[PDB]
Amino acid sequence: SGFRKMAFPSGKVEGCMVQVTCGTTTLNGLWLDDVVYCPRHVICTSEDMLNPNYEDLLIRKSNHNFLVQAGNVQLRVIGHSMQNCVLKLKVDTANPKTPKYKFVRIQPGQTFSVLACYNGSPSGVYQCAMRPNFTIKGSFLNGSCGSVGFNIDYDCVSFCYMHHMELPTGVHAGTDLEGNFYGPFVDRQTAQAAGTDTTITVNVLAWLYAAVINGDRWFLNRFTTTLNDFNLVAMKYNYEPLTQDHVDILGPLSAQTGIAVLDMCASLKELLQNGMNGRTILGSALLEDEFTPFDVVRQCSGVTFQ
Amino acid sequence: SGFRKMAFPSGKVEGCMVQVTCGTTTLNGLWLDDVVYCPRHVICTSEDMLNPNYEDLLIRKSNHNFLVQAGNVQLRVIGHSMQNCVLKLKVDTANPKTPKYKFVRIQPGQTFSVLACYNGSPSGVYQCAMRPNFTIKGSFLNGSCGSVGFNIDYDCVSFCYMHHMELPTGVHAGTDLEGNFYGPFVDRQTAQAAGTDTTITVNVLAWLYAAVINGDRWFLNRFTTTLNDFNLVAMKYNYEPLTQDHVDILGPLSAQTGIAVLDMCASLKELLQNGMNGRTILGSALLEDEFTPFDVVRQCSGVTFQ
Ligand SMILES: */C(=C/C(=O)N1CCN(CC2CCN(c3cc4c(cc3F)C(=O)N([C@@H]3CCC(=O)NC3=O)C4=O)CC2)CC1)[C@H](C[C@H]1CCNC1=O)NC(=O)[C@@H](CC(C)C)NC(=O)OCc1ccccc1
Ligand SMILES: */C(=C/C(=O)N1CCN(CC2CCN(c3cc4c(cc3F)C(=O)N([C@@H]3CCC(=O)NC3=O)C4=O)CC2)CC1)[C@H](C[C@H]1CCNC1=O)NC(=O)[C@@H](CC(C)C)NC(=O)OCc1ccccc1
């Protein structure tokens, strides 16, 4: 038993990380087949980043202005092009460790693993949710851009995130692997607001179910509620509104624990209105919203990867 | 910026995981050079585990009673022996993906990465501390035994943990890779007590320093204290007593933040005595003790692995 924030094994993605240098900027790139993907802002100087004209900047760059290194081997760059906010560097060699993979654009509230890298060398792995406001709360230092996020379905890596920025609030922003930002952000060093950060209500409910499965139960009260009633309390606390879709997704956990979803809502409502009274749930003193229903089922069925 | 519980990249350890079956029990083994390490209780039936005589049980087992599988390839077992609570299975093939590695026995309060596995297939990676009472709080289901914990120093994997058991309190227990349990536990299905679980005071202080580095500062008060004075307050809250060794270890963070360690102690003391007043620190509503001074420095310097 027990329940922890857990990242996917990172082996398949480690084999795809490289170092991309242009001028004096170095960051990470993702090397799949004969293409290297990295943030287009590799082409910027510190001065450029205040207000870049990427199209004009890229025009000054040739294939040979891009240095790609895998360990100690230099890849030859035979083509380059800008897709939205990502630069695509064509090389003369297919990565012999390319896993089976997809590019996917994930939905708010979904989770994924980040392999944080510096100089194209993996540093560490942690779990992130795409928050409702299209930021993540990660751990990113200078040189970490180009680090990716991903999910694995058995042997298929689904890439969903590439790291580009930190906002003034200290949270993080980035693109899918087609170079389209999550959220209303742009790859420019200017003040940018993410909206109000709402809580992923369905995720909190899954975690409460997880808690019940791991024997955490003080919080289970004797009330039930309605979808509309709970949601009037959700909005007050900046919780995402709950839908029958969400109820159905929680269906397996509800069916396993024997707790109707609307009963768990009633218990969550009282949690929201009365706080935790200095207690903890699965080892936390606040309500956790970065575990999907899938994340908890995974960790109750013992799904493995190959 | 930002600060997260982060596991080491798991690629080098993934290549060492195999499946070990004996009779009808299946669990994980670690395949390094031409040896496979796994918990000796692979040789037990469900009935055996109530009171096993391992020596008598092992006597009935031959080399051929052990099935070792790497993916779909069966390794041939040419020798077996019991070292403490681990079984060592000699095979006719050296693992071609054996990384550089060490066996180390870690100290209480230190941290390490767990690669949770089932059927010799990696499932996920998370970070654990060897608590002062020699348990860990992990996420382990049936079939997860033989999963290992490790640290990486650049290219060297230091193996320090193999998973064996869950205690009645829901926490986890296991051995070093020489098969010696951490703590007073035995590989038998009987009620076993870990003592009082104390908090790793030095770790909490490192995390408070991390918080300061990431801009969390309400908790910084105007008091200082003495080592003996703080420790009189530590013991009351079941905190580990703080020593000049601990002070020195925090020296780099103290020197970077400009906060004397004893000032941080005074702030921690008031945190302990007055609680958090519904506030949070680095996104948590309680005091975190599973980040070592090394874990926070790592995440402030951007150390990478190769
Ligand atoms: C992600 C990636 C990124 O693009 N950068 C760019 C800046 N930086 C690299 C710096 C490092 C210092 N510097 C420099 C570097 C190098 C040399 C000289 C030099 F002056 C140099 O010679 N070399 C190599 C190696 C060293 C050497 O000796 N010889 C060489 O030839 C150098 O490498 C200039 C370049 C790294 C970051 C970040 C992600 C941030 C969030 C997470 N933490 C972050 O910093 N950059 C951005 O996000 C940035 C994108 C722009 C809009 C284009 N925006 C941003 O987030 O800014 C706000 C911010 C920044 C930091 C913290 C908080 C907020
Ligand atoms: C770690 C490892 C471990 O050794 N075990 C042993 C028991 N279990 C395997 C079971 C599973 C059910 N069962 C069985 C298995 C298989 C077949 C038939 C069958 F009846 C079978 O035919 N096969 C294969 C595959 C299936 C098939 O169709 N054909 C085959 O041939 C089978 O595999 C009997 C064997 C898995 C666990 C755990 C770690 C615990 C902590 C973390 N979660 C845990 O469960 N075991 C222990 O820790 C245990 C060690 C003993 C002291 C020796 N002690 C313990 O923790 O017990 C208390 C406890 C247990 C669970 C939860 C909480 C507390």
Curated annotation (Swiss-Prot), chains A, B:
Active site per UniProt: 41 (for 3cl-pro activity), 145 (nucleophile)
Notes on activation and inhibition: Inhibited by pyridone-containing alpha-ketoamides compounds 13a and 13b. In turn, alpha-ketoamide 13b (tert-butyl (1-((S)-1-(((S)-4-(benzylamino)-3,4-dioxo-1-((S)-2-oxopyrrolidin-3-yl)butan-2-yl)amino)-3-cyclopropyl-1-oxopropan-2-yl)-2-oxo-1,2-dihydropyridin-3-yl)carbamate) inhibits SARS-CoV-2 replication in human lung cells. Inhibited ex vivo by michael acceptor inhibitor N3. Inhibited ex vivo by compound 11a and 11b.
Subcellular location: Host cytoplasm; Host Golgi apparatus; Host nucleus
Reactions mediated catalytically: TSAVLQ-|-SGFRK-NH2 and SGVTFQ-|-GKFKK the two peptides corresponding to the two self-cleavage sites of the SARS 3C-like proteinase are the two most reactive peptide substrates. The enzyme exhibits a strong preference for substrates containing Gln at P1 position and Leu at P2 position
Cross-link Glycyl lysine isopeptide (Lys-Gly) (interchain with G-Cter in ubiquitin), where in sequence: 5, 90
Taxonomic superkingdom: Viruses
Peptidase C30 domain residues: 1-306
Cytoplasmic side: 1-306
Reported function: Cleaves the C-terminus of replicase polyprotein at 11 sites. Recognizes substrates containing the core sequence [ILMVF]-Q-|-[SGACN]. Cleaves and inactivates human TRMT1, preventing tRNA guanine(26)-dimethylation of tRNAs. May cleave human NLRP1 in lung epithelial cells, thereby activating the NLRP1 inflammasome pathway. May cleave human GSDMD, triggering alternative GSDME-mediated epithelial cell death upon activation of the NLRP1 inflammasome, which may enhance the release interleukins 1B, 6, 16 and 18. Also able to bind an ADP-ribose-1''-phosphate (ADRP).
Subunit structure: 3CL-PRO exists as monomer and homodimer. Only the homodimer shows catalytic activity. Interacts with host FBXO22; this interaction promotes the proteasomal degradation of nsp5.
Protein name: 3C-like proteinase nsp5
Protein's organism: Severe acute respiratory syndrome coronavirus 2 (2019-nCoV)
Gene: rep
Residues of the full protein shown: 3264 to 3569 of 7096
